[PDB]
């Protein structure tokens, strides 16, 4: 019943307009919610350009008949998110309806290089007959990295698990890579290395049993 543009892009600093359509908008108007991963939705606009406190004034919007618009001026990196249209049907039991969502991409965000921190297994974990190396990657943009591990200088073919990148509070990305070893594997090599490649550059951190 509620239809919105599923994908819109805007250049950083420019104005974007997200639209929603549906007969249910004629009665109680549209409301808009910003949705970021790992986070609860946030009401940004409803009614006749009603803006909750805490929402910056670059957000605005209104409803006209069966159509509604959410307008963001001077769009910023933190505005990149999913936006959901919302309404209440006027017929029947008056169900609350949600649009399918609009994925807003903010183009031209500045590149940032990754910072890499590598922790060796703790002595307490080794005593529990396990060994986990933890490679933490922060502050990079765009959110595409490749992570490779080495035992001494040989590539590791088992035990690696890396997260998908996720946004930080500063709108850069973070990711983490784990290498699960036995204590025997950890102690039998001179060192292990975590190699992070981002935009053609590589950062390698190395730890050794001691």
């Amino acid at each position: 019943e509620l239809t919105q543009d599923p994908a819109v892009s805007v250049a950083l600093g420019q104005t974007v307009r997200i639209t929603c359509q549906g007969d249910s908008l004629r009665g109680y108007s549209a409301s808009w919610y910003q949705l970021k991963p790992g986070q609860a939705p946030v009401l940004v606009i409803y009614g006749k350009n009603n803006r909750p406190s805490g929402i910056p004034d670059r957000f605005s919007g209104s409803t006209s008949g069966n159509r509604a618009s959410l307008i963001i001026t001077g769009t910023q990196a933190e505005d990149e998110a999913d936006y959901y249209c919302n309404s209440r049907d006027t017929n029947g039991y008056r169900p609350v309806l949600f649009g399918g969502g609009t994925k807003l991409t903010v183009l031209g965000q500045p590149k940032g290089a990754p910072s890499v921190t590598l922790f060796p297994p703790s002595s307490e974990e080794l005593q529990a007959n396990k060994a986990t190396l933890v490679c933490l990657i922060s502050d990079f943009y765009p959110g595409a990295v490749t992570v490779a591990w080495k035992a001494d200088s040989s590539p590791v073919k088992a035990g690696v698990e890396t997260t998908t990148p996720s946004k930080q509070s500063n709108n850069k990305y973070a990711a983490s890579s784990y290498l699960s070893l036995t204590p025997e594997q950890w102690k039998s090599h001179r060192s292990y290395s975590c190699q992070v490649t981002h935009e053609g550059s590589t950062v390698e951190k190395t730890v050794a049993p001691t």
Binding site: Y33, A40, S87, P95, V96, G99, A174, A175, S180
Partner: protein, 232 residues
């Protein structure tokens, strides 16, 4: 000032019944508000579940009406959701929310002709699975100044091999918040999750300030307070 907080078991077996409660604080449940449940399946959009008005009726998403019931406990200032015969399609983050009153007739105050969802809970993660709950093992990530700015060091906690999501991590019982970076969890081939929380602190404090990470894994009723000390 009205605030909402979801509670409930984070793991439900298939064909079981999901039971969630939302606590209302900073305000009373005894109003014309529509106390609401919403969910977000992973990788999918928001879905309205239903609503209840104290002294009024209920109202449900027809696609879920055969399995969802919403109640009110006026004595506890809570309202609740029960979802029966769950399957994988019900794995989601569940939110409670507040919807102000609306009018169906004329001559109401003008505010009541607008629908919106004002206040939201933080959300609770529900995983439908036959797998058993597993509590985490917590290990220290001993301090290191290699990747930090001058005069500071990074130390942390590894929260290893738990199921299901989520875990929360604080530092020094919440007194330490500056410089804390808790990373989203990885899902291992074992089907168990692991995450790390790191805090960057002044190097001058390492030998004198106690650092403890407070790990909470509610699905397994496990709490761990792990002391993190410099290596020797």
């Amino acid at each position: 000032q009205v605030q909402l907080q979801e509670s409930g078991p984070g793991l439900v077996k298939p064909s079981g019944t999901l039971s969630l409660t939302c606590a209302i604080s900073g305000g009373s449940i005894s109003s014309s508000n529509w106390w609401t449940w919403v969910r977000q399946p992973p990788g999918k959009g928001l879905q309205w579940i239903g609503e209840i008005q104290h002294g009024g009726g209920t109202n449900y998403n027809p696609s879920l009406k055969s399995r969802a019931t919403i109640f009110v406990d006026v004595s506890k200032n809570h309202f609740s959701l029960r979802l029966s015969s769950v399957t994988a399609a019900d794995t989601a983050v569940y939110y409670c929310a507040k919807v102000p009153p609306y009018c169906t007739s004329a001559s109401c105050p003008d505010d009541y002709y607008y629908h919106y969802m004002d206040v939201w809970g933080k959300g609770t993660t529900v995983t439908v699975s036959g797998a058993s709950t597993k509590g985490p093992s917590v290990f220290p990530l001993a301090p290191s100044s290699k990747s930090t700015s001058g005069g500071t060091a990074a130390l942390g906690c590894l929260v290893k091999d738990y199921f299901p999501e989520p875990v929360t991590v604080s530092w020094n019982s919440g007194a330490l918040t500056s410089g804390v970076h808790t990373f989203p969890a990885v899902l291992q081939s074992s089907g168990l999750y692991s995450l790390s929380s790191v805090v960057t602190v002044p190097s001058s404090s390492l030998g004198t300030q106690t650092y403890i990470c407070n790990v909470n894994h509610k699905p397994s009723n496990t709490k761990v307070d792990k002391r993190v000390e410099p290596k020797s």
